[PDB]
Scaffold this active site. Structure first.
Site, PDB file in Angstrom:
ATOM      1  N   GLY A  59       5.957   0.274  -4.525  1.00 51.13           N
ATOM      2  CA  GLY A  59       5.291   1.481  -5.144  1.00 51.13           C
ATOM      3  C   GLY A  59       4.518   2.324  -4.168  1.00 51.13           C
ATOM      4  O   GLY A  59       4.162   1.887  -3.078  1.00 51.13           O
ATOM      5  N   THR A  60       4.103   3.565  -4.514  1.00 48.21           N
ATOM      6  CA  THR A  60       3.527   4.437  -3.548  1.00 48.21           C
ATOM      7  C   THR A  60       2.061   4.163  -3.422  1.00 48.21           C
ATOM      8  O   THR A  60       1.494   3.564  -4.288  1.00 48.21           O
ATOM      9  CB  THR A  60       3.735   5.895  -3.979  1.00 48.21           C
ATOM     10  OG1 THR A  60       3.138   6.102  -5.211  1.00 48.21           O
ATOM     11  CG2 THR A  60       5.229   6.194  -3.978  1.00 48.21           C
ATOM     12  N   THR A  61       1.454   4.599  -2.317  1.00 51.42           N
ATOM     13  CA  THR A  61       0.097   4.309  -1.985  1.00 51.42           C
ATOM     14  C   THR A  61      -0.926   4.952  -2.827  1.00 51.42           C
ATOM     15  O   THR A  61      -0.924   6.156  -3.025  1.00 51.42           O
ATOM     16  CB  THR A  61      -0.245   4.660  -0.565  1.00 51.42           C
ATOM     17  OG1 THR A  61       0.855   4.218   0.247  1.00 51.42           O
ATOM     18  CG2 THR A  61      -1.592   4.057   0.069  1.00 51.42           C
ATOM     19  N   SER A  88      -0.262   1.957  -8.743  1.00 46.88           N
ATOM     20  CA  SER A  88       0.861   1.745  -7.900  1.00 46.88           C
ATOM     21  C   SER A  88       1.744   0.628  -8.413  1.00 46.88           C
ATOM     22  O   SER A  88       1.336  -0.278  -9.099  1.00 46.88           O
ATOM     23  CB  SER A  88       0.347   1.400  -6.461  1.00 46.88           C
ATOM     24  OG  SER A  88       1.414   0.951  -5.650  1.00 46.88           O
TER      25      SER A  88
END
Lengths: 204, 246, 241, 244, 226, 196, 126, 195, 242
Positions: free
Chosen positions: D30-32, D75
């Site tokens: 997942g993204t930060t 996230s």
């Protein structure tokens, strides 16, 4: 009449010395119509006798209901229920339906085979232990019976003197009760055997 | 086969029942000896640490004043099932019968809770075999074993748990048809000292009786017409007394 | 392979679980009814025993389901226990509703459905109980049946369930008599029970007995469970002891 | 190893639930997402990757609001994090009806941790696989937690998760060093941006869009709101200046 | 009926009369108005006899279950709260009036509880039909702090005034004394204000003074083979 | 049965009449109407005595949970539980309850919760049946941000007029003082306060 | 093949549980039906297991469901027994509704109906 | 319905049922039964409130019929009566009460004895040789003692029943416009034409 | 071989492998707890291991306030720690209003323990991996320590310890009670009973402690509070000074 006792009927239970008796009239009524001359109030399960007064439909229904409850016990423990124990069983059946309740006044009578001791009990509509061992009466002639019984009552009469005492109490009361007047059956109960004796009396 | 409660085996029986039986055998040793005026029930306590309070373990738990129990098998299963047993006893048989139930009847309810925990697959039956001893005014003093197979048996003297097999022959040999309670209490300790030694003492062996009525435990007086608790738990000090005269 | 749950059949149209449930039965002791026009005897044998197993205070392989129908049990006693309660409850339900003690047929047919029902529906285990139903109803007189754990019934003149079903059946039909006596029926049950059972002496304490008779005083139906001492005496008569 | 996954309630011999560890691994892809707690607020910034250059810019958020004062950013999987915030809005709302006040941040921490725990406890559901950083301002001041898919939470001075947790935890670790004092929420807006910019070198294949949000007691009236306009542009200029 | 409670220092006493009336007719001359919740909690019933009897039983089994569960002495305090809850649920459609008192380690307690679920504490209470007649005796003659002696004397006096002015209160007085850390003392028929008067003739006569038509034996047991 | 609670600078002091009447029969004359639901949060009860007790115990079940999980409840927080219960149980119950409490940061706060259940922040409130006899003396004679002696004297005197003009009011005048010093009980007896 | 369970279909399109159900029918006694023009005769084999088997009380293989429809079976005797009783409650119920006795065409649908239902589901065997 | 009688004689049971069906102020039909067979030798007449009568008769009919098929053997009248009593006594505690009152006559073929059981609405089984509900029982019970004997032939029971119809007719405002007279015997159940 | 992929299915030894792997999940946070009895207090001192510097330490805890007079110390994992803490709190609440009095240490521990048995009885939940130890001074039993285990086994104690290095704690405690010949600590204020628990833990582990590295909960008579880091600090120089 009253909604809990249109169809009448009377039961009377006394104690003697190591004996009980119980007796009832056999008239069924429905308002002002006398319907049947033979129709017993008292029923029995094993060695405990029960009369059930009241609205006639519920006498018949609890006769069946109690037979179902007693017999489940008897088979399972391999032995008869006792008339001490049996008291609290009536008390719970009546209280289960406090709302919309049974309209009866049952009266137990019976003698233990583990004390040899007479036990009588009364219950109301939703049930109570009325644990006097004076004498216990219920029915539409409830008022009438409490006095007639009291007058005659000497404690510790011999069984055959006790038959005189309860039959007489019942007969006077019945003539002057509107919703019972026909027939009588008297149970003289002892440890050994149980003698049933129908009276001969007046019809109205 | 062995390995669902649902699957029957080629020679039959469920295996979960057999494995639950195995659990009992990993247990502690409890044993009962019927005398002619009592039943003595005895078991030991262990807990690993000695820093443990031993008077906090429940293993001698009165279900009713008329009827005591012990177990062998799972400790957790006991507390839960004692709890459940009591609850059923008042609902079916103290609101109806009007007094605390018969020794025979109550043993049947206990078996019926087990049985429900066998019928429903994915739900194991209890890890315990109990001994349930009691008194009633009809069938007298009585003793039972109720197995995690949901069946119960009446017995004259019996033992269950790990040390059962050693105890039972002692019981065959030493039982006589007429005994007193006091000769039974001494026979009970004697046999139970076979189960363990190096740690047996009056504060770590828990022993109770279901003997004669005691109004001392009734806690209200001036009512002669009822009886008092049949049950009596003997204290740690009593257990030491009996162990010295032996 | 097909030794799993109950929905699934075997490709030979066998449900393995009813077949195994049959086999459960012969791991609990022999149980025999023999029908006679004078009465029915029900006789049973204990699965195992020890010298301090109490078995003179109670029965546990002969249960009264009502006051005219009683059952001998062979098989798992746990499975038995729930089914006996359900039978007995129903027996009194019939009493309440019709004012007659329940017919033998209605009671067997009910329980045949119930056994069948635990196999057919859901994930529940089938039952592995054989009950010899011995009854009286005022339709057919005296009646014997037995029900399979499979959940069906057949009427009999003699039947044996429990351990040693084949041999116990053979000795029974060998010496059976069509009219019989109640007294002879009791004797033929001890004679068979001796040869089938691997206990050295056949003791009163390895026997339970009950008899259902209308010929022990007519007008009435009398269920007579034999006490230990009555059992103990009748072994003498037949000279096993 | 093999075995004791394929179930989500089965204990391993080591003493663990495997499948629950595999959850954390999804959160890593997942993204930060980071949160920097500040002395009179909290700042949440998130790295929103650009699928293609056909995406509408500043119209898709992984920031969602809870009640009117609690920020959340997740996230992990984008829709799982959504599903967990919806449940949270209903729970914050029941608290709010019942007591006639907005939630405490410790209150929400308890409630959320029970809903994640409920899906690790049963056999017919897959446990969640998102972390969700959340916090806000209450009576008792500012507070920041990060809830792991294992259903574990603690407060943080500063929290990071996603692909960029390697860079982000390190930048935050400098942030406490340079400011043990607290750091104002304003200066943390400009800070929030630099942290993401360096965390975007773990997702370098694609381009990103920077969205900052905040909630501050004195510069937002206790309320959560998106940082936009001039504040948002200044942070861009800050991050651009120092990265080169 | 009449019921009182008198708090004293070393415990609490609960007294109540034996007569039970259901209409203008007396159901029982002697029948208990001291029901047992637990070995150290007792209570007396007033109102409709059926509702009080049922309730006490229902709550009693639960407090004996509780004693075993909490593995400690039964509180009076547990009992009231549970009972109160029970009463609430019917919404006052159950007609039970009770005085519950007991000793537990928190001490002696003396409570009144109504059909509605109104709950009260005092150091002297009463409920029933004859409650107004006893209440007068307590307020005047009671003072704060008493011995065993004075408490038992004051309790029987209140019921006794009860009998003499209240119609539904009659017959004998049964008293139960619960002192802190001692056995409840159930003193059946402590006080009689008026003994029985006898009837003046013998009413027992020969048989045939009552007519018979048939004589029969009805079954009650199973025959053998004879 | 008149109950009040009245704020001042250092806190709030609850007042209550300890007479409980069911018809003309005083059911009990020394049963106070002061019920603790928390350390710094207390409640006064008037209306139907059964109804109010039943509400009262459930507010504490919630506030037990409230203390343990969510930090201490505020005076406001508890008063909301009351409002919620009274409102949903409109036709089963009429509860006239005054909830009051001390916070540190906010001082004493008084909320009357009506029969129908709402919430109404007030600097002084009176509720019940005994409360409709002392209104005009409560308005005139009160002043904000009092000193402690003065606040007790205000509560004692208003409740003393209640007893002259209602019969459901009497017993002893109970007070529970809520301040940062703790919880303090105060009492007077009729011998004293009818000479006023 | 796909006899591991009832609900799963089969490449071969034949639900195995039904096919094996048929196979089970061959266990039980033969029954034959032959129609006339003024008759139907419904006969069945009544196979005797032992000579101790009663003819006093032992069930016939043929069961009347209602007073003009007749039914025989072939199969698992255990299973037939509840199938015949279920058939019957409806059958009688047919008169409760219409005040008409049971039509043979309505009845076959119903018996096929209880059966179809059991197959459709997964938590019962046919 | 507007007249219902029962008289039990030496080897038969005789039941009479109203033809008229009174609905408000109009008699919608003057020739309808108010009796249905339970079994080939057990007959139940009914009377009471309209609408209750019709659905109740048919529902009871379905049940006794279903038992008869199950056991392949017919239930004894004694059984049947207790079944019909049980439904009424349950209904009086249920949502929808009936006001259906029944007399069930049966020639018991196991005790070889005629039996008449009167059952009222509330639910009371009584064995009685007479029977009637409404304000028809309030005329004909008195009448019945004198003209009855300990037994008589079915022909003499028919004439006895005709006498009670004549008593009712004279003294009761309710119209019924003749009666269906059905006899219950050992050889079935038949209709006799009677005025 | 079957028999930890299922909750309820026994092994052929009569053990439940899966349930026992929960007694072995209590090492997952790797902390030690000690709780001992004084003569007017029950003390529990457990590690607070704050691993990272990104964490704020004052939200790190294992000691939970359950009720007015009841604390609970958790050894084992955080997710299940919180589930244990809400249920015990929820039950604490239920007992007070239903039965109208405070909740003792036994009553709570027995109820949770029975609850653990239910969760193992079904195969529709799992056991938790957490060990619970309840601390209180009881209303008529005084100082009480009841350890509730993951199976639902409970036994009371004079002293108990939990964690990876529990064995090292256990010998030190045993030797103390053996030599003293009492089931208590005779120090007559809680400030020195706390010091005593710190004292034994330093020796067992061989580690110094500091303000951030301990957590201390104190059950005192009729009240309960968990101590701040600066009050723990006062205690720690009291040890060092004699």
């Amino acid at each position: 009449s009253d909604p809990s006792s249109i169809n009448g009927g009377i039961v009377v239970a006394m104690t003697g010395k190591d004996c009980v008796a119980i007796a009832c009239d056999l008239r069924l009524g429905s308002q002002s119509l006398g319907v049947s001359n033979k129709f017993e109030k008292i029923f029995h399960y094993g060695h405990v006798f029960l009369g059930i007064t009241g609205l006639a439909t519920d006498v018949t229904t609890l006769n069946e209901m109690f037979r179902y409850k007693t017999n489940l016990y008897k088979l399972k423990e391999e032995r008869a229920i006792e008339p001490e124990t049996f008291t609290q069983l009536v008390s719970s059946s009546l209280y289960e339906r406090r709302f919309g309740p049974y309209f009866v006044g049952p009266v137990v009578a019976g003698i233990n085979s583990k004390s040899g001791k007479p036990f009588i009990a009364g219950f109301d509509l939703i049930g109570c232990i009325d644990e006097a061992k004076d004498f216990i009466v219920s029915g539409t002639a409830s008022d009438q019976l409490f006095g007639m019984c009291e007058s005659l009552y000497e404690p510790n009469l011999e069984p055959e003197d006790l038959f005189e005492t309860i039959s007489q109490a019942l007969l006077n009361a019945a003539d002057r009760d509107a919703l019972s007047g026909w027939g009588a059956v008297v149970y003289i109960i002892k440890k050994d055997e149980v003698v049933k004796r129908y009276l001969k009396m007046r019809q109205d | 086969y062995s390995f669902s409660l649902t699957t029957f085996s080629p020679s039959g029986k469920l295996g979960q029942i057999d494995y639950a039986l195995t659990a009992v055998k990993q247990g502690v040793t409890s044993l009962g000896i019927k005398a002619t005026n009592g039943v003595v029930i005895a078991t030991e306590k262990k807990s690993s640490s000695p820093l443990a309070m031993s008077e906090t373990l429940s293993k001698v738990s009165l279900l009713t004043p008329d009827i005591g129990a012990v177990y062998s098998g799972m400790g957790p299963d006991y507390r839960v099932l004692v709890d459940k047993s009591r609850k059923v006893a008042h609902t079916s048989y103290k609101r109806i019968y009007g007094e605390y139930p018969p020794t025979k009847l109550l043993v049947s309810e206990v078996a019926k809770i087990m049985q429900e925990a066998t019928q429903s697959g994915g739900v194991r039956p209890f890890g315990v075999s109990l001994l349930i001893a009691g008194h009633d005014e009809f069938n007298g003093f009585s003793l039972y074993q109720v197995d995690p197979s949901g069946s119960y048996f009446p017995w004259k003297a019996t033992a269950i748990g790990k040390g059962s097999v050693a105890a039972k022959t002692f019981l065959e040999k030493r039982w006589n048809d007429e005994l007193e309670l006091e000769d039974a209490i001494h026979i009970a300790l004697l046999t139970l000292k076979e189960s363990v030694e190096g740690e047996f003492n009056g504060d770590t062996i828990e022993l109770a009786i279901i003997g004669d009525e005691n109004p001392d435990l009734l806690g209200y007086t001036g009512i002669p017409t009822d009886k008092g608790p049949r049950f009596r738990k003997l204290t740690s000090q009593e257990i030491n007394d009996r162990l010295e005269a032996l | 392979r097909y030794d799993s749950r109950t929905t699934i059949f075997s490709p030979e149209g066998r449900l393995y679980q009813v077949e195994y449930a049959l086999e459960s039965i012969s791991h609990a002791g022999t149980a025999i009814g023999i029908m006679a026009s004078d009465g029915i005897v029900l006789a049973a044998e204990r699965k195992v025993t020890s010298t301090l197993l109490e078995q003179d205070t109670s029965t546990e392989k002969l249960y009264k389901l009502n006051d005219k129908i009683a059952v001998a049990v062979a098989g798992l006693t746990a499975d038995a226990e729930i089914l006996i309660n359900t039978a007995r409850i129903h027996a009194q339900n019939y009493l309440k509703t019709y004012n007659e003690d329940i017919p033998v047929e209605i009671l067997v047919r009910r329980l045949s459905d119930i056994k069948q029902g635990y196999t057919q529906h859901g994930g529940l285990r089938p039952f592995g109980v054989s009950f010899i139903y011995a009854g009286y109803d005022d339709r057919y007189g005296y009646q014997l049946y037995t029900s399979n754990p499979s959940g069906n019934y057949t009427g009999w003149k003699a039947i044996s369930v429990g351990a040693n079903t084949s041999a116990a059946q053979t000795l029974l039909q060998m010496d059976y008599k069509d009219d019989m006596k109640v007294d002879d029926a009791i004797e033929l049950a001890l004679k068979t029970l001796s040869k089938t059972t691997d206990s050295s002496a056949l003791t009163y304490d390895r026997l339970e007995f009950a008899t259902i008779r209308k010929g022990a005083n007519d007008g009435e139906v009398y269920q007579k469970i034999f006490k230990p001492q009555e059992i103990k005496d009748i072994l003498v008569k037949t000279g096993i002891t | 190893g093999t075995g004791y996954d394929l179930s989500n309630s089965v204990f391993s011999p080591d003493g663990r639930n495997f499948q629950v560890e595999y959850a954390v691994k999804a959160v890593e892809n997942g993204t930060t997402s980071i949160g920097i707690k500040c002395n009179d607020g909290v700042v949440f910034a998130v790295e929103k990757l650009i699928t293609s250059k056909l995406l509408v810019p500043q119209k898709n958020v992984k920031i969602q609001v809870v009640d009117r004062h609690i920020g959340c950013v997740y996230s992990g999987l984008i829709p799982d994090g959504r599903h967990l915030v919806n449940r949270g809005r209903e729970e914050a709302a029941s608290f709010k009806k019942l007591y006639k006040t907005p939630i405490p941040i410790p209150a929400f921490a308890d409630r959320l941790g029970q809903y994640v725990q409920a899906h690790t406890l049963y056999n017919s559901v897959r446990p969640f696989g998102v972390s969700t950083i959340f916090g806000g301002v209450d009576k008792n001041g500012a507070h920041l937690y990060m809830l792991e898919p294992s259903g574990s939470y603690w407060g943080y001075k500063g929290a990071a998760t996603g692909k960029g947790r390697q860079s982000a935890k390190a930048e935050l670790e400098k942030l406490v060093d340079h400011h043990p004092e607290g750091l104002s929420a304003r200066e943390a807006v400009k800070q929030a941006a630099k942290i993401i910019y360096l965390a975007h070198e773990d997702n370098k294949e694609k381009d990103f869009e920077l969205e900052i949000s905040w909630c501050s007691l004195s510069e937002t009236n206790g309320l959560h709101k998106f940082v936009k306009g001039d504040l948002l542009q200044e942070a861009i200029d800050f991050a651009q200046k120092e990265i080169n | 009926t009449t019921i009182v409670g008198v708090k004293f220092n070393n415990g609490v006493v609960i007294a109540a009369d034996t007569r039970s009336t259901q209409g203008p007719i007396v159901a029982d001359k002697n029948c208990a108005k001291l029901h047992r919740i637990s070995p150290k909690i007792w209570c007396a019933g007033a109102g409709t006899a059926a509702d009080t009897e049922a309730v006490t039983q229902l709550i009693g089994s639960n407090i004996e279950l509780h004693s075993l569960y909490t593995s400690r002495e039964p509180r009076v305090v547990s009992a009231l709260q549970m009972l109160k809850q029970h009463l609430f649920k019917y919404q006052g459609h159950i007609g039970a009036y009770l005085i519950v008192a007991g000793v537990d380690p928190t001490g002696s307690h003396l409570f009144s509880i109504h059909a509605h679920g109104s709950t009260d504490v005092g150091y002297y209470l009463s409920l029933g039909s004859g409650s107004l007649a006893a209440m007068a005796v307590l307020e005047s003659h009671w003072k704060q702090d008493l011995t065993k002696e004075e408490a038992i004397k004051l309790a029987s006096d209140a019921i006794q005034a009860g009998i003499w002015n209240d119609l539904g209160s009659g017959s004998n007085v049964d008293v139960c004394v619960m002192e802190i850390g001692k056995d409840a003392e159930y003193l059946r028929n402590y006080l009689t204000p008026n003994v029985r008067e006898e009837k003046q003739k013998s009413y027992k006569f020969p048989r045939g003074t009552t007519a018979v038509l048939k004589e029969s034996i009805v079954n009650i047991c199973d025959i053998q083979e004879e | 049965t008149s109950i009040m609670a009245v704020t001042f600078k250092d806190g709030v002091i609850l007042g209550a009449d300890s007479r409980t009447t069911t018809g003309a029969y005083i059911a009990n004359r020394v049963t106070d109407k002061l019920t603790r639901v928390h350390d710094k949060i207390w409640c006064c009860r008037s209306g139907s005595a059964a109804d109010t007790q039943a509400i009262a115990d459930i507010v504490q079940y919630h506030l037990e949970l409230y203390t343990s999980q969510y930090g201490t409840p505020s005076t406001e927080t508890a008063a909301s539980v009351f409002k919620e219960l009274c409102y949903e149980n409109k036709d089963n119950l009429t509860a006239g309850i005054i909830v009051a409490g001390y916070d540190d940061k906010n001082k004493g706060e008084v909320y009357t919760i009506p029969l129908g259940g709402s919430v109404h922040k007030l600097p002084y409130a009176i509720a019940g049946s005994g409360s409709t006899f002392i209104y005009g003396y409560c308005d005139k004679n009160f002043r904000e941000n009092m000193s402690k002696e003065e606040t007790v004297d205000f509560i004692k005197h208003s409740l003393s007029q209640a007893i002259k003009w209602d019969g459901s009011s009497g017993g002893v005048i109970r007070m529970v003082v809520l301040t940062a010093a703790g919880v303090e009980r105060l009492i007077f007896y009729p011998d004293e306060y009818e000479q006023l | 093949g796909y006899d591991r369970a009832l609900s799963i279909f089969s490449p071969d399109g034949h639900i195995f549980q039904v096919e094996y159900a048929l196979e089970a029918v061959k266990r039980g006694t033969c029954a034959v039906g032959v129609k006339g023009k003024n008759c139907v005769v419904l006969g069945c084999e009544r196979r005797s297991t032992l000579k101790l088997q009663d003819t006093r009380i032992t069930p016939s293989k043929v069961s009347k469901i209602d007073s003009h429809v007749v039914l025989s079976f072939s199969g698992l005797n255990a299973d037939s027994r509840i199938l015949i009783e279920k058939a019957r409650v409806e059958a009688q119920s047919h008169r409760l509704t219409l005040e008409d006795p049971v039509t043979v065409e309505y009845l076959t649908r119903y018996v096929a109906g209880v059966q179809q239902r059991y197959t459709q589901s997964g938590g019962v065997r046919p | 319905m507007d007249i219902i009688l029962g008289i039990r004689v030496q080897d038969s049971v005789i039941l009479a049922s109203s033809k008229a069906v009174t609905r408000g102020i109009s008699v919608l039909k003057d020739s309808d039964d108010k009796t249905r067979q339970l079994s080939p030798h057990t007959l139940m007449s009914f009377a009471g409130e309209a609408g209750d009568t019709v659905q109740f008769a048919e529902y009871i009919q379905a049940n006794i019929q279903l038992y008869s098929i199950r056991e392949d053997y017919e239930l004894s009248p004694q059984a049947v009566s207790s079944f019909v009593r049980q439904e009424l006594a349950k209904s009086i505690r249920s949502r929808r009460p009936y006001q259906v009152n029944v007399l069930i006559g049966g020639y018991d073929k196991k005790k070889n004895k005629p039996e008449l059981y009167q059952i009222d609405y509330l639910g009371t089984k009584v064995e009685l040789p007479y029977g009637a509900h409404g304000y028809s029982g309030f005329y004909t019970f008195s009448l019945l003692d004198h003209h009855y004997r300990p037994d008589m032939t079915t022909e003499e029971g028919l004439d006895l029943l005709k006498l009670c119809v004549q008593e009712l007719e004279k003294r009761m405002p309710m119209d019924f416009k003749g009666v269906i007279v059905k006899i219950v015997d050992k050889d079935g159940i038949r209709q006799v034409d009677d005025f | 071989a079957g028999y930890d992929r299922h909750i309820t299915i026994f092994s052929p030894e009569g053990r439940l492998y899966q349930v026992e792997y929960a007694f072995k999940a209590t090492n997952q946070t790797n902390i030690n707890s000690l709780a001992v009895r004084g003569k007017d207090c029950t003390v529990v001192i457990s590690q607070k291991k704050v691993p990272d510097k990104l964490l704020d330490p004052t939200t790190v805890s294992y000691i939970f306030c359950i009720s007015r007079t009841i604390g609970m110390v958790v050894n084992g994992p955080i997710p299940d720690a919180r589930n244990a803490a809400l249920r015990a709190k929820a039950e604490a609440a239920e007992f007070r209003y239903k039965y109208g009095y405070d909740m003792p240490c036994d009553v709570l521990a027995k109820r949770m323990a029975n609850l653990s048995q239910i969760y193992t009885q079904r195969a529709y939940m799992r056991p938790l991996g957490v060990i619970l130890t309840f601390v209180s001074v009881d209303e008529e039993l005084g100082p009480s320590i009841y350890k509730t285990d993951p199976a639902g086994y409970y036994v009371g104690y004079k002293a108990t310890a939990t964690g990876p290095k529990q064995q090292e704690i256990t010998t030190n405690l045993e030797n103390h009670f053996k030599k003293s010949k009492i089931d208590h600590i005779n120090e007559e204020s809680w400030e020195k009973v706390v010091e005593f628990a710190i004292t034994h833990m330093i020796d067992a582990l061989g580690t110094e402690f500091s303000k951030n590295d301990l957590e201390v909960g104190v059950a005192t008579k009729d009240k309960f509070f968990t101590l701040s880091a600066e009050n723990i600090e006062e205690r720690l120089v009291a040890i060092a000074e004699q």
